[PDB]
Design a binder for this molecule. Sequence first.
Ligand code: OL2
Ligand code: CL
Ligand code: CL
Ligand code: CL
Ligand code: CL
Ligand code: CL
Ligand code: CL
Length: 252
Amino acid sequence: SRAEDYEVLYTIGTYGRCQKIRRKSDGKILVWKELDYGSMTEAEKQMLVSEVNLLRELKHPNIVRYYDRIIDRTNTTLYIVMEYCEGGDLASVITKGTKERQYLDEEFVLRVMTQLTLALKECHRRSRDLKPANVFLDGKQNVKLGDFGLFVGTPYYMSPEQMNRMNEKSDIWSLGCLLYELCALMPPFTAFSQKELAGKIREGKFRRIPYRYSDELNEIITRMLNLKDYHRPSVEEILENPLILEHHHHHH
Ligand SMILES: CCOc1cc(-c2nc(-c3cc(OC)c(OC)c(OC)c3)cnc2N)ccc1C(=O)O
Ligand SMILES: [Cl-]
Ligand SMILES: [Cl-]
Ligand SMILES: [Cl-]
Ligand SMILES: [Cl-]
Ligand SMILES: [Cl-]
Ligand SMILES: [Cl-]
């Protein structure tokens, strides 16, 4: 309700800045996203209101949880309060692995696969970017999909359908790309330009993920990267995989 209900501890990152905060009433650790709407038009503020209502709706263990919205009309600043994910985002995990030359555990990849697949299933059920920067880790081995998604960069994760026209199986391809990058510490198709990239995607060829990962894990990631959307496994078919066990799911 009010900014003064919370105390900022410090800034985590800088669409304004993201800050770790403490709710005064009970000391709960949260974060908020700080947005200056002062320069926005009425139309834009209207679709901002629409977006925020949308986030207040989705509740799921594998989706970053919204708590509150605070309007500071004096500084024309809006705060979106959400849960704190102490393990940060998946992009930093991959970069860390890349820089330090250390692959991630299969167990970790299975957790990401299982929990992101359940996030997707929920998103599809309701009607969000499937990329490492939009994936967050809490302090309990849980994985959460953030709200990014609802030019300069190469569109590494774009499916062959999207690269022409025109589909939930497209999301499966994107997940395949993300899990592939998590394993290999590089995307399955790399290139310097989008046109070069598009040429590679159309061939649909890539390296096997590293041998430290099982044939079973390689197989399902490879299936997700099938050129034909109808050969990619559905969320249901993914979760039926013998690889995926109770402990790979979320725990409170
Ligand atoms: C502008 C980003 O919006 C979101 C932020 C979070 C969110 N992020 C973190 C977080 C914590 C970190 O500390 C380790 C960290 O450094 C690696 C980090 O890097 C980006 C992020 C903690 N809690 C959070 N709730 C979640 C979702 C969003 C979003 O808008 O989807
Ligand atoms: Cl390595
Ligand atoms: Cl391993
Ligand atoms: Cl390899
Ligand atoms: Cl166990
Ligand atoms: Cl539960
Ligand atoms: Cl949870």
